[PDB]
Amino acid sequence: VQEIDLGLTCDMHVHVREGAMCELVTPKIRDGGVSIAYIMPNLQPPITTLDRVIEYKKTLQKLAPKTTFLMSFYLSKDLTPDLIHEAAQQHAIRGVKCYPAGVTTNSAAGVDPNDFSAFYPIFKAMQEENLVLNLHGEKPSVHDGDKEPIHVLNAEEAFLPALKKLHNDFPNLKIILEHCTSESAIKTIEDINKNVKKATDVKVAATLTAHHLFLTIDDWAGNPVNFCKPVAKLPNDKKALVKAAVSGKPYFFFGSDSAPHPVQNKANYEGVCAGVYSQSFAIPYIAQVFEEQNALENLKGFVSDFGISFYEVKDSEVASSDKAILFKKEQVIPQVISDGKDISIIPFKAGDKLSWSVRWEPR
Amino acid sequence: VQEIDLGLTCDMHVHVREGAMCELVTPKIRDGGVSIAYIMPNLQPPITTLDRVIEYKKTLQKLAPKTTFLMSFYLSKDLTPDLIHEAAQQHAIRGVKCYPAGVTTNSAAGVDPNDFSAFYPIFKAMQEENLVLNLHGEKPSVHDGDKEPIHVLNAEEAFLPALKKLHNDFPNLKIILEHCTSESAIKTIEDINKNVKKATDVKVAATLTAHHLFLTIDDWAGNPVNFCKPVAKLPNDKKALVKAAVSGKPYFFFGSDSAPHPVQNKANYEGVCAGVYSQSFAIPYIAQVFEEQNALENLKGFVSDFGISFYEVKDSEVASSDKAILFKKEQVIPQVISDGKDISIIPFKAGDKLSWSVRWEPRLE
Ligand SMILES: [Zn+2]
Ligand SMILES: [Zn+2]
Numbered sequence: 222v223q224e225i226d227l228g229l230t231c232d233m234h235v236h237v238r239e240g241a242m243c244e245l246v247t248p249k250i251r252d253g254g255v256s257i258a259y260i261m262p263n264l265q266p267p268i269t270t271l272d273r274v275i276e277y278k279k280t281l282q283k284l285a286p287k288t289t290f291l292m293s294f295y296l297s298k299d300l301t302p303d304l305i306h307e308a309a310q311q312h313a314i315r316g317v318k319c320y321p322a323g324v325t326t327n328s329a330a331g332v333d334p335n336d337f338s339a340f341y342p343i344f345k346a347m348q349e350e351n352l353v354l355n356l357h358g359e360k361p362s363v364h365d366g367d368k369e370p371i372h373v374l375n376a377e378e379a380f381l382p383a384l385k386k387l388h389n390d391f392p393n394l395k396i397i398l399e400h401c402t403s404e405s406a407i408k409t410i411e412d413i414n415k416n417v418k419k420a421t422d423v424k425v426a427a428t429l430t431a432h433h434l435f436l437t438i439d440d441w442a443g444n445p446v447n448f449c450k451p452v453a454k455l456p457n458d459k460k461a462l463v464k465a466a467v468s469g470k471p472y473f474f475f476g477s478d479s480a481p482h483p484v485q486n487k488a489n490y491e492g493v494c495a496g497v498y499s500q501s502f503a504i505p506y507i508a509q510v511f512e513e514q515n516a517l518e519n520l521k522g523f524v525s526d527f528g529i530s531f532y533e534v535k536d537s538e539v540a541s542s543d544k545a546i547l548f549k550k551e552q553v554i555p556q557v558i559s560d561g562k563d564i565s566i567i568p569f570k571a572g573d574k575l576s577w578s579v580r581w582e583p584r
Numbered sequence: 585v586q587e588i589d590l591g592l593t594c595d596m597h598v599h600v601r602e603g604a605m606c607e608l609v610t611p612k613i614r615d616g617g618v619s620i621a622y623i624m625p626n627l628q629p630p631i632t633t634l635d636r637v638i639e640y641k642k643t644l645q646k647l648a649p650k651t652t653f654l655m656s657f658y659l660s661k662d663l664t665p666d667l668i669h670e671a672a673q674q675h676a677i678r679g680v681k682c683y684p685a686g687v688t689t690n691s692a693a694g695v696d697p698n699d700f701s702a703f704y705p706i707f708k709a710m711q712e713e714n715l716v717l718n719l720h721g722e723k724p725s726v727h728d729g730d731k732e733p734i735h736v737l738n739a740e741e742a743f744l745p746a747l748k749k750l751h752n753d754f755p756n757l758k759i760i761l762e763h764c765t766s767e768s769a770i771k772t773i774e775d776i777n778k779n780v781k782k783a784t785d786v787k788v789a790a791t792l793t794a795h796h797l798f799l800t801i802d803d804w805a806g807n808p809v810n811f812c813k814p815v816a817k818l819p820n821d822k823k824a825l826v827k828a829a830v831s832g833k834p835y836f837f838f839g840s841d842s843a844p845h846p847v848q849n850k851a852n853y854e855g856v857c858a859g860v861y862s863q864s865f866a867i868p869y870i871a872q873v874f875e876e877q878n879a880l881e882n883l884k885g886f887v888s889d890f891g892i893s894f895y896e897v898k899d900s901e902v903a904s905s906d907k908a909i910l911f912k913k914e915q916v917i918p919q920v921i922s923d924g925k926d927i928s929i930i931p932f933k934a935g936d937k938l939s940w941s942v943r944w945e946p947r948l949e
């Protein structure tokens with residue numbers, strides 16, 4: 222019967238796809254306890270045009286009238302500085318998401334993190350419009366050449382100098398290292414923020430998923446349902462991520478990277494789709510971690526305050542002022558999330574018990 | 585055509601299962617270029633009795649009369665020193681294979697490698713009978729307690745102290761660290777063999793698979809068909825394995841760990857079966873590596889000489905004196921291996937090119 226008032230919760234890294242999948246999962250943002258969602262653009266084809274991002278947002282709002290949607294473009298050679306200014310001036314986007322080519326779902330149209338300079342006109346326009354640059358910070362794999370090989374376990378660490386160069390070259394650009402998975406990345410974000418004294422001083426932040434606070438390599442070795450990018454790494458990495466999430470620092474906040482796939486796309490003998498589905502119980506998953514760490518006092522900062530501050534979400538843009546309330550009523554995660562038609566998704570931690578449930582309080 | 589006479593080739597780590605799968609796969613030992621096969625025992629139930637291992641060998645010999653079968657027991661709670669002596673004296677087994685409990689396929693009846701002491705009477709009997717102790721050298725994963733976490737990436741390295749203690753405590757026992765996957769393991773096998781002058785000096789050997797000479801973690805992360813145990817690890821590990829395989833050292837030789845699974849046991853969202861199926865093109869896979877490494881002169885040692893020497897295979901045990909001839913005919917690995925009934929297997933490197941092919945020639949002398 223214990224309750225925690227989390228206010229206007231934020232999930233700053235959401236995939237809702239299109240079609241019937243989108244109709245199934247978009248109402249789960251609210252059901253999982255999230256008021257505000259930052260919507261990723263890696264559709265097929267990626268979202269790179271104004272009319273597409275406008276229609277997509279209106280489609281989400283039709284499906285969930287109480288959810289606040291922040292939208293993004295997919296970083297691509299199709300983008301122009303003029304397009305960035307137009308989209309920003311119409312409040313059609315809040316940021317631009319960068320996928321390195323080949324590293325994850327629908328990243329074939331993505332970029333080379335060896336030649337980010339080709340997108341400096343875009344970053345310049347984003348900086349002028351106070352838009353956020355979201356990075357999938359993994360270098361593409363390479364096992365040859367003059368250089369130490371890059372593989373799924375060190376690809377994030379190998380990306381960190383690209384992060385530092387972007388922050389150096391665009392010091393007023395807000396940049397997010399999305400879904401951090403390595404101890405090395407946590408330390409880099411902390412070191413970048415060494416001189417920050419209030420939350421509004423943060424320019425470079427990192428999001429943390431629910432599933433990387435639980436998983437290590439042992440959990441997805443043999444279990445495609447736990448396979449995502451960046452891959453869950455070693456116990457020392459998991460410990461560093463959990464310490465960061467409960468740290469109370471303004472430069473870490475919640476982004477689930479909830480990535481829904483129909484079960485048949487996870488049960489492949491080759492080319493398994495990467496992604497973990499956590500939307501249905503997003504805030505309860507996080508509460509489990511914060512309870513185990515005796516850090517529930519810091520839950521609201523991680524899932525509400527810090528994301529709102531970083532994205533400068535105004536009360537005038539919220540779709541609903543309802544507050545998310547956690548209450549300590551145990552529940553069992555179902556085996557599947559289904560639309561009763563052709564889509565079944567296996568949820569993260571299917572079959573496990575969670576100590577907290579989430580409801581909504583007006584005003 | 586360029587040809588290499590590989591003679592009596594051996595694959596010292598073979599799974600052929602039972603029933604219809606066995607009927608499909610056992611003929612592929614010969615088709616893949618292998619004369620001598622060491623047959624692993626992790627059946628359901630595991631092979632732990634004399635009559636079972638005798639009847640199993642008879643089944644295999646019927647399916648492949650020209651293949652030489654060396655048999656093993658599974659290291660289980662039920663094994664007794666008297667049974668080791670009995671099976672050895674009847675030439676019913678050449679060794680005993682140890683699976684750490686829970687680490688891989690049909691390992692639930694296996695051991696705790698943290699307390700091997702309960703099996704020391706078995707190892708003493710094996711040592712007296714000159715039987716080989718085959719180790720799946722991985723410690724089971726542990727994430728609780730206060731000691732070192734163990735996970736799929738360091739479980740082999742974590743096992744290496746256990747290997748050294750067994751070698752120290754049973755210095756005359758032939759021991760194989762099966763399917764090595766880590767640079768750490770290669771270094772340990774190399775240092776155990778620091779003072780070895782000829783092949784017959786080797787007491788502790790290691791087998792290397794075909795697929796660990798190709799694969800890294802990147803290749804199985806989203807590809808269940810490439811998932812096996814021990815998992816393929818980092819590029820630095822694969823570098824060490826390939827260098828060991830072409831080293832010409834007598835303490836490394838070929839064991840495929842070819843592990844057939846029906847495709848439906850790989851296309852799972854959880855509990856993907858561990859194992860790569862390499863039998864159908866076993867020797868051509870290895871030839872690919874030795875060619876790319878410019879070490880084809882060392883191929884015969886890796887796939888024939890060293891395994892025959894370590895297991896002390898005699899001409900009198902040999903089911904057929906046919907010689908395996910590698911010839912430089914490019915070929916394309918199929919997408920599926922099937923029996924035309926209910927079984928389809930995805931072979932290793934399905935769809936790829938191989939520079940070599942294999943055929944058989946009689947001994948005419
Ligand atoms: Zn991503
Ligand atoms: Zn994502």
Ligand SMILES: [Zn+2]
Pocket residue numbers: 688720762763813814841
């Ligand atoms: Zn094994």
Ligand SMILES: [Zn+2]
Pocket residue numbers: 597599624841843
């Ligand atoms: Zn095996």
